[PDB]
Structure 1
Amino acid sequence: DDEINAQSVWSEEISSNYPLCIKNLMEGLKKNHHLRYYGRQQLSLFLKGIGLSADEALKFWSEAFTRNGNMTMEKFNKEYRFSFRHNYGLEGNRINYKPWDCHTILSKPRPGRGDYHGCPFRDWSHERLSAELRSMKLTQAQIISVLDSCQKGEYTIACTKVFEMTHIAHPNLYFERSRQLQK
């Protein structure tokens, strides 16, 4: 828990290593104090894969869902705690829940209104992507290249370009490669 824990996953240092899909899920969680089912699964299993423990996950999800008075702890415990415990096998299930790779993410139903799961290189408009990439200090030529990959449907190449420009396809590999470059 020394490095990855319920508090450090909200730090700029750790979160600077997240790929765009995880950044988007964390932003939706931060703003709405909730994620719908597919996003809960994508984000909770990514965090499990980076080493967020069972206890630290339950802290993280209970604090994020009850933040700013969004729901009572009693409602969280009645309507969500089981689901997050299940993702960690804490009620005894033996389903093999592994972190989702990019192909798996892309193959989930596309996000609609109110959804934050998916792959932003496919799911965001070019304008929204451009604004986000400018926030990450990319220049116009860089953004044009990333958008070229997006328009060709080469979403994991677009994501690889963003990794290279800001420093098998799998969000957890993006995180691990990025985190290693901080050490």
Structure 2
Amino acid sequence: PNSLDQIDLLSTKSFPPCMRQLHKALRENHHLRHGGRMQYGLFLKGIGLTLEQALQFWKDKGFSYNIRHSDYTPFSCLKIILSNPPSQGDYHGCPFRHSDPELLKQKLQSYKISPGGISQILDLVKGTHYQVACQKYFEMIHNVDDCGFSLNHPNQFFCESQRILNG
């Protein structure tokens, strides 16, 4: 068992916007509603990590989460984009599809993306080209001109990001 904070750096470097957001929310709120627990939990499962939810003796909902090295299937991009739209207490979904563009812009700014980077992303989103906007985000983040793959799965994003960071 290990704390979720062991993968803070990893989320920033290799997690797609949709999992990055869930990691953040889990870390700041100490919980996630079902949709989030599924999307994020299953993503981690795909990498080979087991997320564990626990209730602390003193019970703030009073949960604590951990992870360890290791049923349901990790969600693809189309699954995330097209089904289970997030409600107000929810942090799941795809921020390209689900975030109001003003709020998406502010998230992307907090991520230190360039204005030209942001502007290309927002134009792709207007077009409903969510996955291509996410490749664009992959390119900005890894500082490469062509991601070189056709994005269709948050788990693929991770493997492809790691492969670049691994040389």
Q: Contact 1:46 / 1:172 at 8 angstroms: preserved in 2?
A: yes
Q: Distance in 2 between matches of 1:173 and 1:45?
A: 13
TM-score using structure 2 length: 0.79
- Name 1:20's counterpart in structure 2: 17
**Comparing 128-137 with 16-25, which one deviates more in the overlay?**
128-137
Higher RCO (CA-CA < 8 Å; seq separation 6+): 1
- Name 1:114's counterpart in structure 2: 89
Give aligned pairs, total.
152
1:143 lines up with 2:133 in the alignment: no
Q: CA RMSD in A?
A: 2.6
Letter in 2 for 1:138: I
User: Percent identity over the alignment?
Assistant: 37
Q: Distance in 2 between matches of 1:140 and 1:153?
A: 20
1:159 lines up with 2:134 in the alignment: yes
Q: Contact 1:121 / 1:155 at 8 angstroms: preserved in 2?
A: yes
Alignment match of 1:173 (pick from 156, 161, 167)? 156
Deviation of the 1:33 alpha carbon: 1.6
Residue by residue, what CA displacement relative to the aligned partner does 1:103-136 show, whole Å, maximum 9, x if unpaired? Answer: 1111222111111111001111222222222233
Q: Distance in 2 between matches of 1:8 and 1:29?
A: 9
Q: Report SS of the residue matched to 2:49.
A: coil
Q: Report SS of the residue matched to 1:181.
A: helix
Q: Report SS of the residue matched to 2:89.
A: coil
Larger Rg: 1
Structure 2: unaligned runs, 5 residues or longer: 65-69, 143-150
Between Structure 1 and Structure 2, which shows a larger proportion of helix residues?
1
Letter in 2 for 1:17: S
Deviation of the 1:138 alpha carbon: 1.8
Q: Distance in 2 between matches of 1:171 and 1:135?
A: 21
**Comparing 142-151 with 12-21, which one deviates more in the overlay?**
12-21
Q: Contact 1:8 / 1:14 at 8 angstroms: preserved in 2?
A: no
Between Structure 1 and Structure 2, which shows a larger proportion of strand residues?
2
Q: Distance in 2 between matches of 1:130 and 1:136?
A: 10
TM-score using structure 1 length: 0.73
Structure 1: unaligned runs, 5 residues or longer: 77-87, 89-94
